[PDB]
Structure formats: structure tokens, C-alpha cells
Amino acid sequence: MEYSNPVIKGFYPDPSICRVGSDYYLVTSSFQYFPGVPIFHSTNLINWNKIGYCLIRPSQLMLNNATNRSGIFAPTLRYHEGIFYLITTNVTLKKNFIVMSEDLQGEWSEPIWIDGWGGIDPSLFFDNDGKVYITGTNDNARGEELGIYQAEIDLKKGSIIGERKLIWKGTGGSYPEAPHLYKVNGWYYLLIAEGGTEYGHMVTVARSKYPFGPFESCPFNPILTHRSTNHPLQAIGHADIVQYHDGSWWAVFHGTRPISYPPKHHLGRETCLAPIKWTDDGWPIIGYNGRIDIKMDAGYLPVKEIIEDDFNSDIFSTDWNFIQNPRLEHYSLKGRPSWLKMRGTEKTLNDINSPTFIGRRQEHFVCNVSTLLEFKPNQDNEEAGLTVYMNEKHHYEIALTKKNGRINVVLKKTVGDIQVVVNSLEYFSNTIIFSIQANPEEYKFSFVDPNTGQTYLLGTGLTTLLSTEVAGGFTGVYFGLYATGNGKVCTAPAFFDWFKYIPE
Amino acid sequence: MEYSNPVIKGFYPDPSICRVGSDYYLVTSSFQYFPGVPIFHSTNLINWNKIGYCLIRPSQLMLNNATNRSGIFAPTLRYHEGIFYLITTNVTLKKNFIVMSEDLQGEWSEPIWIDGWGGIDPSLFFDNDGKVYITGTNDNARGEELGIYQAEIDLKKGSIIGERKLIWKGTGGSYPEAPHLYKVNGWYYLLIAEGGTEYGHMVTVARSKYPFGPFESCPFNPILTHRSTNHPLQAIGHADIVQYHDGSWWAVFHGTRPISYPPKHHLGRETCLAPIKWTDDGWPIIGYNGRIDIKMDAGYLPVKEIIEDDFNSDIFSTDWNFIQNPRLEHYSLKGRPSWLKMRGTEKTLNDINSPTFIGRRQEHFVCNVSTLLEFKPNQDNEEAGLTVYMNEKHHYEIALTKKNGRINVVLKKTVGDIQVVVNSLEYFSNTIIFSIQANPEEYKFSFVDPNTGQTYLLGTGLTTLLSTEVAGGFTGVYFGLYATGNGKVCTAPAFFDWFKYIPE
Ligand SMILES: O[C@@H]1[C@@H](O)[C@@H](O)OC[C@H]1O
Ligand SMILES: O[C@@H]1[C@@H](O)[C@@H](O)OC[C@H]1O
Ligand SMILES: [Ca+2]
């Protein structure tokens, strides 16, 4: 049997996995997007269903001033005696915290802030002796030596017991991070990422008889990397291991699918799966001796995509994210039942601080995305439409707007310091269907007059100019519905009847 | 004593070095730029003076249809019994050739085409037994196994003696390339690049008692790489070794200085220097056990930038390159003595096939570049100015132009599929001084009215949108003087009085 990588496609980085009996749960990083920290369930490690998010309340997720360079960084998920612990960093606040749940269909706890625990990638390990350990990176604010830090933690108090100690510097790669501690076959294993989450990314491992070391580096480190290869999967690492209930071992980690030359990626870092074997002399090796493929052997795992939103429910579907904490009053599913009613503010897609926007990840290279919009702009500044969005300086949009008392469909682009109106056509009704055809190189922007069914190609845009390499930050492309008054409140409401995501 | 890397700054990739007595000569790749293959001289391996170019005639350098993705790839320079051999690939033609010289102040020979020798990075080695070997990469057209290929060569005939043989696959990194064969201390050493000329770049070495192998991989391969580090120098590799006349060993290789995040570079791949030590058991290790720095110890090497062109000579200075083979009649140093007179064609900076353009490499992050132009556009399509140029889809320019019978200074940008006029101001004289202030993040575009000395900032542009990662190809930024008639011949001549390059 076979499966394909990635197992979770689109913007789903830094996977952490947790086994409960014969169920598996997985969390990913979310940066400036709200709600934060998607959570998935699987019974076979291959197929994941999103069950919702871990951070859904302002008290849990403070995203004012967050950008695709900040907000929520790597999350770690652990289970002990009936309680789930989700531990993560809000990099905007420079603070590490834990939330807890005993029922994953319900919401998580208020956060417990871990005072005086800096760095990123916090992780938890429950030892047989009743001790719990927190592990993470060096703290830059304190001028610490580069490497992996650890202490015992009191989970109730959210405080450190005893001393914060450097336990390993890694093999010599940059940014030693993503640390996880495990205990297998009478050894403690410390698993980490090195080389940075880009083309130099790799997984390394060290071992000790003691949770604080001294740790011996694995002699065939790194145990997983696509560095210095031309494989379609790149930037692989930030692994978390699991023993499946049949006794076999597996790792989840992320990787990218870059295109063009030099390689550029726009679907974000995507969650992948690979088997582990343990060598005679007690070391894990991941996949095909430290390498992986898009097609993989499933071992004994039990093997097994169109998404239309009619806005018929008054609860937003789990596909939708907002830029930072949404201004809830600017989105209504109730004003016009069966539609989404959006109120544009002065803020635009060029502004970091919550413009009126709702979006969903691009999860395929080839896809068709569309929406039906009713919008009658009252003034020249007023605008609503469909965006392909990476961050505040990298986005394209097709929209209805007004100029000199005249309604126009426009194609607009922001790339770095360039803001351009690429094309503009007069439009003569209140309703319009916008559609984007995505392929690996190019987005194609069309509109349809709903009353005639006639389609018009308004223009195109390059995928590569929205790539992470170009745009900066740590995320993937979203398709979004937005409204704006371009420096003023938008007096015209925007009504979206539906949204379709049809991947190839 | 110390020196700094890079030793040759700006767009100078794939260095090959050749010792003659106490003199050292070095060549670099030039892609679509004419003249081709710059050649340098040193007496101390640290300080290089450009002595001119190796490919200066149409018969030696056929660049029609060449782009920054094609043209002249890695060159290798060797010396034997009074004759220099320069061997290289014209990738546009998919052909390998050699030119020869016995006097480096004179011109090189007509090319000798090596029929049925494919691949890139051809290299030559003269053995003690009178045999000469050619070494290069796999040939993609023939579906060859990835690795390093070799044969005996007859230099007079430009043909292969005996069989073309795979001699080494490398360590497992992608694109095994840059092969050089040497014989030191009774071993043949095969030195190569792996991992591609980007973030995965590394140098590996293998050895044999025989020139065709079998080759044993060095046990601490790779012997030089900055992969999986955050060092300011990246993408290091494509090395060529030399024994200095004091007996010490040194390697030249290239690397980049990327900025921003993810890392993007715009000064091209730049030539660097590092020492070699030979281990007891007979292996070379480069620099600080396989790593290098911007500041380096000079060993026993004997240690030791404003460039103004007044166009007072009727021979172009060696700083100037053209895009492909120039149309010589469109450039005159004689029509107006002490000025450069340029005739714009229908071709623009957006066209690959020799627009009217002369340019010089950006060799520093911080620099001020300026020119005095006399230009009186006769018609609306007509344009002359100063460009910051990476390739046909990535360039910015400040220029004099005409619109609706009105003269304007404009800032224009081409980034991918975006072409924009960023700013436009009316201008009221025949002469203008254009200046660009470069810093690591930004180019700042100003003009000066020569008669008053008043300066005006017209606009700015991002360095990162001209980076190799963004633009594609294999080159660095040039500052250029250009003229165009935008689809028609330019009826107005452009006169440039001078050009200044003042680096910080
Ligand atoms: O992995 C990341 C690294 O690549 C760097 O650029 O930013 C912080 C690290 O977490
Ligand atoms: O080094 C180069 C590699 O990185 C690839 O992209 O193009 C051909 C090779 O010579
Ligand atoms: Ca509906």
C-alpha cells in the first residue's frame, strides 16, 4: 500500500502529534491567522480531518500587531492522564503559554503564561517518575548560547522548578530548534531541527541515559534532510515522532513544494509523513535512509476534496481564518440569511491591523476559486472582491470599485513597494461572479455576469511574486473575500452568496 | 595578516585559477554579457586586476538568443608549455569549445569545438605521461547517469581519444559538477561541486591512484560548505585549487552575500579565497574545517575603488558589457569626441535580443552611480536613461522621455509581468544628471538639473525584487546606460558625457 506526501497539503507547518489509544491528534502553527493552531484527527496517520482550532478567544490569542513574520509559532501537543496540553509561543508578545482541554469537541482553557521561559518551540515530556520537562530554544533577549534548553516545570503554577539548563548545542547547524524529548528502549532521545526552516533544514537526534544529558550526537546525523538535493520536497524537518498502536514508528514533519528557479514556494510548509526504523545500536533513521518521496510505502497503516460554502449556517466553517483578531461586527451571517455580509473599514489589504477579510488556504497548485458578490459602491474609495493573499505587501485582487461616478471591475496588485491597477472595465450591474484559476505559474482572474453567464478574463498574475521567498514571513497563500473603504469606512455593504474551492 | 572575502566582489562566478611562475590568472563565467569570460591577474591571490576578456569576437562568442539563464557557463583556464587553454560551454548552442593564447595582452584564438562532448563545466588536466584529459558533467540530451565524465582529448583536433567514461557519481548531492582533476603526492584528486549553486552548494573530493578511478570519496566530505548555516557567505563552492609559489595551497570558489529573509542576493556570485591543509592521511580540508569567513588569515601571502569614465578614449573601458553581441553602429565614441553617442532601436530593456545598452556590474551594496545625459526626444516613444538591470523582466530605470509633446523625467519598473511608471515630472532642458544611491534594501533615484545643481528624489525601488531568487538566471545586477524607441527606431541620439561609480 502507498500514500502521498504531503499528508496535510497547504499552509500547515510545525506539526506536533499526540496518540490517545487508537486516535491521533495533530497541531500546526498559524502565525497571524485567527482562529489559531488548527487541530486534526487521524486513525491511520495518513488521512487527517480538521476538528477545529485550539485558540479561539481573544484571551488565548492576542494578535494585534501580528504579521506573517510573527503571531503563533510552533505548537506542541501532549496528553497525560486525561488532559491535553497545548504549548506554544506568541512571538508578537515574546511569551510562552499552555492551554488545556479534557474534551476536544469543547474549547480550551484560559492560557497559563510560563514566566521566564523564553525562546521558541516549547515542548513537554512526561517522565515515568512523575516529573514533567519543558524543552525549548535559546533566548535571544538574554544573549544565551545557541542550543536546546530544558527545565522541570510545574504545570499548575506555570513555573520552572530548579534550573534552566543547556542540554545540547545540536550538530553545528544554525537555529537548533523544534526540540522534543522522548524515552525509548532505556534511552532518552532529543530530537531537533537544524539549518533553519529553509533549504538547509534537517532533523538531528542525540541520546542520553539522563533527561538532562550529557547527550551524544547520532553518528549518522542528520537523520532526515533534503538539503543539497533537487527533490520536489524541500526544507524538510521540525519532526515529531509517534509509535502507532501496531507498534511501528512514524514521524510527522513539514516540507515545501517549490517551483521555478531559484526554487520558490507559495503553498506554505506542508505536513508530511515518514516511517522510522531503529538500528541495532539504538538510533532512529527516518524514511529511505534520511530521505523521503511524494509516493511512500504505507507499511501496515490502514489506507482509505471539493469545498463549497453556501453561508447557510450562522457558525463560520473551519476553513475560514481572519487577519489577526476579527472585528466581529463587520462580518454578519444573520443580516442577510444565507449570505455573508461584510463591512469594509478604512483598513485595506495593505494594512497589517485586521482589515475586513476572511480567507482560506490554497491547498493545491491547480484549483478554481469563485464567489458571487452583490456590491453597489456608494463612493469612489469603496471596494469589495476576491484576493490571492500572502501578506500586506504581496497580494492580488479582483474587485468591484467606483471611479468618477462609474462602476468598474479592476485587477489590482501589491508586490513589495509596487501597487498597480493592471486592468479596469466598466460594469453595469449590482452582482458579479469572480473566479480565479490557479496553476503552478499563474493565477488567471475572470468575472462572470450572473444574468448572462458570459465570462471575461480580466488579467493574470505570477505565483512566484507571492512566494514566501519573495514576500517574507512563514506562511502560505490564502484565497480571501474582502471589503475596504480605502482610508474611509465603506458605506456600501458587501454581500457574498457563496464560495467555491474546486481543486484538480 | 588578513584579507576579506569576497576577493573579487560583484558578478564573478565559477572562478578557475592558473599559476604561471609567480603570476596567477583567473577566469569567471559571463552568461549573456559581451565581451565574455573576464580574466584577472594576481601576484598574491588576494588582489586581482582585470586584464580584459577572453571572448571578444563574434566567432568566439555567439550570443543571439542568450539570456541570464544561458550563454557562457563555467570557464576553466589551464597552462601547458607556454600556451594558455580556456575551455567552456556556450549553453545557448549546447557546445563545448577551447580557445588558446600565448600572449595574454593579445587576443585569443578562434574556437576549437569539441564535437560529441556534452555537459557543462569542461575542465583540462595535463598529466606527466604526455596525456591530456577532459572532464565534465553528464549530458542530459543523452540520458546519461548523473556524475562526472572523462576522456583523453587531442587538443589539436578537438576530439576525444578512446572512451567517454563515468569516473564518479559524487557523494549523493544533486548536480555533481565543476570537476577538476589534479595530481598531488602520488594521488589523483577529483574536486567537484554538489547540491546545486544555491543554498545546498558544497565542495566534495575523491581520490584514486589512477586518472579514471576507481575514486574513493573523502571520509569527511563535504570539504567546504555553508549549507545549513546562517553565515553571511552562502552558496559556496565551484572550487579550483592552486599551490602558491611559497608551497602553500589555496582554493578559489564562489559564494553569495544574501540579504533580507528568506535570503535573497543581488550582487551575483562572488569570487572568494580560502587556504587548504593536507591531512596526514592525504586529504585536503578547506578553510576553518570546511567553513570560511568574511575576514580571513592571509598566511604568508604578501598583503597590499572609485571609477569614473569620461569617455575620452575611443576604446571602451573593461568595465563595460553589452547584452549579447552589440550592434556596434549604435554606439559611437567618435561622433562626439569625449562623449558616448547611443542610438536606441525598437528593442527595449524588456527584450532579450541586444537592446541598445552598456552596463557595469554592481560590486558593492552601498554605492552612488551617476551620468550626465544630453537627450532631446523627438517623438513620444523615445527614451534614454540609467538602469539598474538584472534581466529582461527585472530592471528599474530613470529616464528622459516624451508624452503628448511634453518632456518628462520618469521612474519605470519591470518586475516579472508588472510594468509600471512609478513617477513622472516635466523637465525643461536638454541635459540632465541621473543618479542612483544604492543601499542593501533600496535604490534611490534622483535627477539633477546641471545648470542649477538642484537635486530631486524621483522615487525608490527594492533591491530584493531584482534579486536572483526573484528574477531567475545566474547573474548579478548591472548599472546601465540605455536608449530605446519602444517599438520604433529612436530618431533622437542620446549623448552620455560621463559615468561615475563611487562605492562606500
Ligand atoms: O526556523 C527559523 C529560522 O529559519 C529563522 O529564519 O527564524 C527563526 C527560526 O525559527
Ligand atoms: O549548478 C546548477 C544547478 O544549481 C542547476 O539549477 O542548474 C544547472 C547547474 O549547473
Ligand atoms: Ca448562499
Ligand SMILES: [Ca+2]
Ligand atoms: Ca566626457
